[PDB]
């Protein structure tokens, strides 16, 4: 998208594999605020937002908290307390045409700065002077958007860059976007400290003799003690016999 009409993708109810992003050698900018990139697979959020647009390389520095400039002031504004990641890469191969690509625009004129995450798509003729414009261009009456001139011969700072801004939102609602939380192999007939789906304990896991229902996960003895569990991956029921102990 053009930065003035930046696109927002709302991400919900899915497992996020951030290893695809920080293990990629194709990004020139990868700055995160209020969060560590490698430590992102262990966090759940209520919503994740992915905002994307194209700007100049000169202007990627404005996609950050506390910045000013035409992009931060009038096109895309991040809050001071931003919690997320700003990702960018050079796209001169895609977004520059030989005669000059003009499909990408930015807002040049606006009476006041954008609020954080505000999106202004107005095309109203801007009144730079005393006389009203009445929607007609002319002196002191300017179309508010300007075109980027993306040509391959531009210096790096003037070449197009694609930007993705990830915002991480933690509300008092169910968290629907988490990270992988992989597992390992299981061993039987040996004392292990185990952590199944929501429960944790210590004991020996053995092949069972019970017939759990298709929806039952955790067993329970008469005295409210965990007795058997359903392995999340293999559809096998494991009896939990606490590891041997006794007085000496």
């Amino acid at each position: 998208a053009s930065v003035y009409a930046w696109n927002r993708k709302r991400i919900s109810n899915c497992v996020a594999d951030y290893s695809v992003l920080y293990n990629s050698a194709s990004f020139s900018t990868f700055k995160c605020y209020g969060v560590s990139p490698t430590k992102l697979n262990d966090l759940c959020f209520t919503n994740v937002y992915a905002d994307s647009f194209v700007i100049r390389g000169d202007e990627v520095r404005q996609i950050a908290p506390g910045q000013t400039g035409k992009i931060a002031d009038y096109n895309y504004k991040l809050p001071d307390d931003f919690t997320g990641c700003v990702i960018a890469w050079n796209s001169n191969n895609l977004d520059s045409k030989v005669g000059g690509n003009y499909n990408y625009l930015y807002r040049l004129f606006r009476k006041s700065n954008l609020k954080p995450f505000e999106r202004d798509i107005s095309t109203e003729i801007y009144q730079a002077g005393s006389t009203p414009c009445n929607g007609v261009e002319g002196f002191n009456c300017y179309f508010p958007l300007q075109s980027y001139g993306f040509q391959p011969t531009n210096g790096v700072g003037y070449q197009p860059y694609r930007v993705v801004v990830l915002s991480f939102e933690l509300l008092h609602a169910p968290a629907t976007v988490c990270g992988p939380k992989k597992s390992t192999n299981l061993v039987k007939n040996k004392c292990v400290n185990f952590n199944f789906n929501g429960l944790t304990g210590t004991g020996v896991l053995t092949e069972s003799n019970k017939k759990f229902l298709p929806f039952q996960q955790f067993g329970r003895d008469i005295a409210d003690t965990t007795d058997a569990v359903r392995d999340p991956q293999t559809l096998e029921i494991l009896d939990i016999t606490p590891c041997s102990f006794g007085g000496v």
Partner: antibody
Framework: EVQLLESGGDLIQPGGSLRLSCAAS????????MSWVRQAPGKGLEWVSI???????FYADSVKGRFTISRDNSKNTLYLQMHSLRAEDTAVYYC???????????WGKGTTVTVSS | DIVMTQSPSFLSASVGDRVTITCRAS??????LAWYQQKPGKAPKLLIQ???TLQSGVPSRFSGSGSGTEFTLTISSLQPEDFATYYC?????????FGQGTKVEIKR
Amino acid sequence: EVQLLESGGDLIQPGGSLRLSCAASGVTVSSNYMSWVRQAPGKGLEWVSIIYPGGSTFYADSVKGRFTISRDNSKNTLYLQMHSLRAEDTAVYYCARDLGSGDMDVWGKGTTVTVSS
Amino acid sequence: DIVMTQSPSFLSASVGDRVTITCRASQGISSYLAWYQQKPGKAPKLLIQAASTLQSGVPSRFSGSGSGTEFTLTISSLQPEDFATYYCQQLNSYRYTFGQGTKVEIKR
């Protein structure tokens, strides 16, 4: 008609302070990119400072930390407050309206600043 | 950063001549270039913006063109009021860089 009328230039010692004013007519200062540009005796043009319509301000490296650009909406007037003046600040100072990309179409007649011991 | 080299510093022409002033950027600036005219004791006057858009009211003589790294101002038919100094300016830049200027003088 459309005119920018600047004033306040004077002879001043190094380390002194001076405020330049730029009263506008035909253009609304608060709605425009407004800049100060200077020209030392016998030299070329040097951009000094700019204030965006939204209020953001930016400065050339040669004046950063010493000059401040501001404006008064009720007076439709642009200002340049200069502190810690140096001999190399000696110039004619113009205020100009910036059409957005740096192309300035409305200029004042300029006011002359001389900094010397 | 991007350095604007304007050539020549001085050029002599006659009334009615076709004049070509060159402004070279140290790397590609698309069409982000403006041209100014300044006469002694007067404020600069904007002639062309965006490398090829003659400002309203400027006579048809002044022609601007060029793209990428080499830009030119062309005065198709020099008139007596065109002997002056001309400046290029990089547009859409954090630095607002100007060229050194070209003084067009009376040939004899």
